[PDB]
Design a protein around this ligand. Structure first.
Ligand code: TD6
Ligand code: TD6
Ligand code: TD6
Ligand code: MG
Ligand code: MG
Ligand code: MG
Lengths: 556, 556, 556
């Protein structure tokens, strides 16, 4: 009876079970207690293995992989704070739906709360942020393998969205010669080992029914709001709203083509909000709305009914409107509630939106971050994808740019953390294999700086733009008090990123003008490597430029 | 009734209450939801403020400050994944006793579970790892200020060791002019505002009683095991064990002067374990024993009684011996249980230890990490302190070096995470103002790389030795299969650290021999700045040198 | 490898371990899954076994035993809702400190969440209400017996107060021939089996330090408030306050002799409140103060310092005064802070207390519940003890009677549940062997009615007075709205208790006047049995009488 061998048979059942639920990517950090899990995964030919030394970055790498692939993505870490570092990505997945399967090695129960090295209390340490939590018992042949495979199958099969924490205690010895221990225990499962389905198939679907009064509401004065959704969903929603004749307020994350662009500006104009008061229903598809003026308009508007369609569960309207919360695949939902051609009812807002875009176009020349956002369309890689960071970049693009319909945009806009953007971008790139443009701020790039290691391996060109305004300049846009703004809010670090690029052998450009930025991009798309482009700009120009465009358009 | 003003009065009560329990250092990360806490702290003259952009590093900075200063240390972060990043340091503090007071700003309850940006479930998110958890209510004048201060005073007053999670929801508006809203609410507390004491004094002491049969047991054949303790405590334990005539097995963390050095080697010798079988009692002071051979001997020994004296609560013997678990300040415990002069009963172990050290000296010449550990006394700054990283460095120093009695050693040997070593060393340096030698591995340095930002501000010279053996070479010691060793265990990243140091404008050396290392040190001690010394060594030389020395000493 | 036998050896280690921490009484409910625990308990001769069929009642029986004996009391229930029924007594123990050890049998992990009969999720099902929770692992010889005993030893050894939940999963077969499986596993513990000590002695004492400025504060104008404490402690507190010349406000639970009786009445008089605002310090010993006027005076008074001395931990002043919380054995605390002989400073309150008592005595004649309460001192059994139920009985006794110093009083005044009073009283009687007077209301008697089964076995006479005012007439005392008062507050059940008594073969009396009541008492004290005395009174006479006395005394 080799405990080491049986540990690995147990682990093998876990990993093999995960392959029956679409787990292809597995992100592994180093350790010894994780040996049963890590070796079982290394020997399993279904997996693509990714490795990293920072478990926080590892969780975000998995998050980007799951985010793009729409499949569950596995993680293996050893016991201790390695497990805790998964918390940020797990929380994000809890908000936006990524299926992260966290296999967290643990000490056996006899070694907890007795002063053993690298042993902590792991069951339940993520509280309610996992969708499902499994604390596996101490491995033993007296618990049949069909129990273990059934537990995994229940968790993955019923997983609508979010993370799964599977705590995996293993007792030492962890190494030794692998004999027959556990083989007949495994072979109890018979030809399941040669099958391609779960041992237990439990996959109920969670979805809202057709709205039987839709033929009434689609003829009222409605507004369509498009939040985060897939690229194809964005094109379908644009066509649907156009057909209804309802104005479409389209978020940077919507990939609708934003037919009424610069909503963050023109929603600040009284003629627009006055026109939107006529709306009798608001139908929102997707969530995590980006722009400040849009969140204020949502909070203040009073349609008779407010609907939010999304495949995420729970309430998504932070203003708590009377109305409906409809759980569905958006494309399914649109087919279930088709539009019928009706003439448009807005007259003032299309003109305001065009005038707003003209007001931004008037200011495109300065080599600043607002202008980079406004012009970002010109740098999108063909057949590529955009990963947009948090703080000012996503806000400025949403307010100032009109992104093409169906061009994929990815982001971390659940909790909007600045702590994993580089490694998330790495996973986003690796999952699809597409050329990738990623744009982040300086503090964000410092936060996830060691994920540049991961960016040394990309399967297609990845451009990382670091906007360096020397601090978190979103807080210059906020009414912070001037006496404490720098030390306690902006926190300028006074760095550049050429030495960072050189450390990880990444190409680097610090362009001084539009010509040099173009040159840097043209060089960058030529090889499957990461190029770091640092755009150094004056601290508060971007925030000021947005405030000024905001005032101007409000006076139209 | 300005929400903004009252928010700031509420927060002001929280921070001022913390000043009555010795909180002096406060570590602050940037954010908007945290504005009430951050501004209250910025206005309160009792605090020393430290700032950082990475909240994981922020937590470890607080941990090092608290570890050295023995004072409770406060942290302020904004809502979201920023809170989750505190989990590693919080867990470590729960193991080794540092008092971290985490003021975690939160959205108000009406903005939880409704799709609100940067809003997550924060109460209870640290599960059972905080010593105390306080989920403060939504601020309101209808709850009296004496409840708020009384709750904080209860948490801080009863805090024997570990972290306190104080979750602080605040509703917007967060900014505005300070009017008199909440002023009379504050003035309910009277002249407590001019006092220097808690509003409620609740400070019961948790301490074990004097052992009435101690005069019986001190006459038996005992062994003293000295784990992590204060420097003064290490010296007192040395004198105490010497007077009793009992052998002292002294950990690298013990600061006892290790009179039987290289215990990790001679404990592998059957004559040593045979002599130690004669011991009728083992009295261990401190815990988190470092060495493998020591943990194995502790696991196998069967004294009549095994005692562990420590100010940490709970079980500390991972082998679960029959015996006693005594909660006490170690110096206090020694005074309550004095030694009586007795002739020593060990004869063979002193000789074995002298031979072990001589065998190590025979190998001191190679420019390797085993030799660096062995020779490390030659580089300790006068009246300074040593911060020792995890994995091979602490193990090699413990096995191969004899550190001087009472010279301060610091570490993160609770969970032994490699995720916060640089920011912890920064806090350790700032707490004492002493010149500091910190030594970490390459993967540890990459893990906490951005904490080089913090090392741009030290009050005395800090030498950071980064031992670069290209991966986690502690894992070459385990019998992992060679087929997966590099990719799935060692994870070499193939970097150097010259550009990291240059990025943060820190002096850098890559010495090639002992004299160049001496030159680097002499350069480093001249100014109160951080110097990065990268020691490049071959992958497995250190590990296999330790194995060979173990075989040699074990066959003596 | 008999699973049945090993289950029983694992259980045997658990029970034997408890005998080393003073567990003498064990309360057992019937079941099959609990067989290992139950049979281990039955063959262990250290225990006194009590049985009951209602697990809620069983927990309260354990609570009464622990409440009197001040020793830990063990409980065994089987899996399922039986475990949930322990919650009330566990919560009460969490407030007032009884050490109830809950051994809750469980299904093994492979039978959780799979549709198995009588299997529920039991780990953590009591949330934070146990002082300590242990979720034992699935029994196996691969976890050594020293681990199990050390876990129990940690839990019991550090238990200052409150409950311990020990969840004990067992896999079938539960029955079978008892062979040698697990015998050498037990024997690893050596002669620990013949010992009388814990395997691990871990017993730190939690106690507040001596107040170094006590000689300053005892010379000021103080008030002594005496809450729940032991009978001895009540006598010592009376002597101490008398020595200081400080007024003593003595609760019904204090056993101080209440030298200023009827505080619930004279505290309503403004001359008392005005004189009491001269007080510079209030020293309260014990907690769970009974009377409304006393709670109101505590809420409004503002001494310079407010101290609460008690052996219960945590805050105990629901008004959150500036002052001190001091954790100590109350008698020890008085010896550490002795009184000094000083002239009394109150003049008006003694006159008021005397006049108030006179006002109550003027109304002693009517055959009502207020008069029974007022006259209860004249009926206490010699060398006996009083168990006072919740709602009006304890309020009226506290307001209207003067109980003798040092005469034992017991109650459930933590959460003041009306759900376990009869079974608690049974435990109170069985623990001390003393003749017992227990007084409850009609709804309270219905709540725990089947606990009449337990009252068939008492070791000395127990009188159970059931005051039948046809509903919860405390809700006639509150300003409830009259239109809904009967159906939704009073809830009269219109029963008597003659047939209940008859069902359990208990002697029964329904006295119609004082003479018949005294005859009933005289009959009852002659034999070691339970006699039920039902006192039928008109619904609102007690509540109104108390209101009238309050108004009258308030105008003196
Ligand atoms: C892990 C964590 N911790 C702290 C924060 C708080 N937080 C922000 C949110 O408030 C902004 C959410 C949003 O975009 O809506 S923004 C921000 C500064 C960003 O600095 P930058 O990269 O230089 O970019 P710039 O501001 O354009 O100059 C911080 C520090 C966080 N989000 N996540
Ligand atoms: C946050 C987290 N995540 C993962 C781990 C697992 N873990 C280790 C545990 O074995 C440490 C037990 C010990 O320190 O004795 S060591 C180690 C590699 C260290 O690489 P290095 O700095 O180059 O040093 P070297 O090995 O001497 O070459 C890892 C990755 C962890 N501890 N903490
Ligand atoms: C398990 C549970 N559930 C409900 C309650 C609420 N509760 C009470 C407490 O609130 C009284 C607070 C106190 O005593 O300080 S009293 C009470 C009615 C009692 O009726 P009775 O026995 O006929 O006695 P009488 O009112 O004097 O005639 C109820 C129903 C509870 N305490 N516990
Ligand atoms: Mg910035
Ligand atoms: Mg290394
Ligand atoms: Mg009643």
């Amino acid at each position: 009876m080799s405990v080491s061998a049986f540990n690995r048979r147990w682990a093998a059942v876990i990993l093999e079970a995960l392959t029956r639920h679409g787990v292809r990517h597995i992100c592994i950090a180093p350790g010894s207690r994780s040996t049963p899990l890590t070796l079982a995964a290394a020997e399993n030919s279904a997996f693509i293995h990714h490795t990293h030394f920072d478990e926080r970055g590892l969780g975000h790498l998995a998050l980007g992989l799951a985010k793009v692939s729409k499949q569950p993505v596995a993680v293996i870490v050893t016991s201790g704070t390695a497990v805790a570092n998964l918390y940020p990505a797990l929380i994000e997945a809890g908000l936006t739906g990524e299926k992260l399967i966290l296999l967290t090695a643990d000490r056996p129960p006899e070694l907890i709360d007795c002063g053993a090295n690298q042993a902590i209390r792991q069951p339940g340490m993520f509280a309610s942020h996992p969708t499902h939590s499994i604390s596996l018992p101490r491995p033993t042949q007296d618990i049949p393998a069909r129990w273990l495979v059934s537990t995994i199958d229940h968790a993955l099969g019923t997983l609508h969205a979010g993370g799964v924490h599977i705590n995996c205690p293993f007792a030492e010895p962890l190494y030794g010669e692998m004999d027959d221990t556990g083989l007949s225990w495994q072979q109890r499962l018979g030809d399941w080992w040669q099958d391609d389905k779960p041992w237990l198939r439990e996959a109920p679907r969670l979805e809202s029914e057709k709205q039987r009064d839709w033929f009434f509401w689609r003829q009222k004065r409605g507004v369509v709001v498009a939040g985060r959704m897939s690229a194809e969903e964005g094109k379908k929603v644009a066509l649907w709203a156009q057909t209804l004749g309802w104005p479409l307020i389209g978020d940077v994350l919507s990939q609708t083509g934003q037919p009424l662009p610069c909503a963050d500006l023109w929603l600040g104009n009284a003629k627009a909000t006055s026109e939107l008061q006529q709306a009798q229903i608001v139908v929102q598809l997707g969530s995590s709305l980006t722009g400040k003026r849009l969140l204020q308009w949502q909070a203040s508007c009073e349609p008779e009914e407010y609907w939010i369609v999304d495949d995420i569960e729970g309430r998504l309207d932070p203003a708590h409107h009377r109305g409906r919360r409809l759980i569905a695949n958006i494309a399914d939902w649109l087919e279930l509630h088709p539009a019928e051609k009706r003439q448009p009812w807005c007259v003032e807002i299309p003109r305001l939106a065009e005038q707003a875009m003209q007001a931004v176009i008037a200011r495109r020349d300065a080599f600043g971050e607002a202008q980079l956002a406004h012009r970002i369309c010109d740098y999108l890689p063909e057949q590529g994808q955009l990963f947009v960071g948090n703080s000012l970049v996503v806000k400025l693009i949403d307010a100032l740019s009109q992104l093409p319909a169906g061009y994929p945009v990815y982001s971390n806009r659940g909790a909007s953390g600045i702590d994993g953007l580089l490694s998330t971008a790495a996973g986003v790139q690796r999952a699809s294999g597409k050329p990738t443009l990623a744009i982040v701020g300086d503090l964000s790039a410092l936060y996830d700086l060691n994920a540049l290691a991961l960016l040394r391996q990309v399967s297609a060109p990845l451009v990382l733009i670091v906007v360096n305004n020397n601090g978190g300049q979103i807080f210059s846009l906020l009414p912070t008090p001037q006496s404490e703004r720098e030390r306690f809010y902006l926190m300028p670090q006074n760095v550049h990123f050429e030495h960072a690029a050189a450390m990880f052998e990444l190409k680097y450009h610090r362009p001084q003008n539009w010509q040099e930025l173009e040159t840097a991009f043209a060089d960058a798309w030529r090889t499957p490597t990461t190029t770091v482009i640092e755009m150094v700009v004056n601290d508060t120009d971007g925030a000021q430029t947005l405030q000024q465009l905001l005032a101007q358009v409000s006076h139209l």
